[PDB]
Design a protein around this nucleic acid. Sequence first.
RNA 1: CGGUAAUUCCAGCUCCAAUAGUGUAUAUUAAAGUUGCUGUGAUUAAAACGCUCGUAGUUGAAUUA
Length: 72
Amino acid sequence: IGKRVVAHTKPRSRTSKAVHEAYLNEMLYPVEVAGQRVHATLVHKKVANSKTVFVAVYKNITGEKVKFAFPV
RNA sequence: CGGUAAUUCCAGCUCCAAUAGUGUAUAUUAAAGUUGCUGUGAUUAAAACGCUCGUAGUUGAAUUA
């Protein structure tokens, strides 16, 4: 995996979205991501996003609690 | 309302409202969602330019941990 920094809001390559997108693709070589869905739901008067990397055909490096699965 | 049987005219009695106040005339505001920001209407009641291009004006997709 690569090692790039995330600035404080530097170019679009140094943004959180690009870093996580790059980390997701570089950590998943050669299997391909072909779908992402986020299922927001209310829990204890709070909103809990649950990102799901779908169609797989990370927490330590990035911090996103993302579940990986396969298409139905 | 009154053209011959007037609940409205000119009168008489009766009683209604307000009251040391009570009508008139003009004008401002509300009524008036009959000037619309909140808030109007435009087939037929008033009201979409004959149609297209177009500068000023107004309005402009998602995205940056």
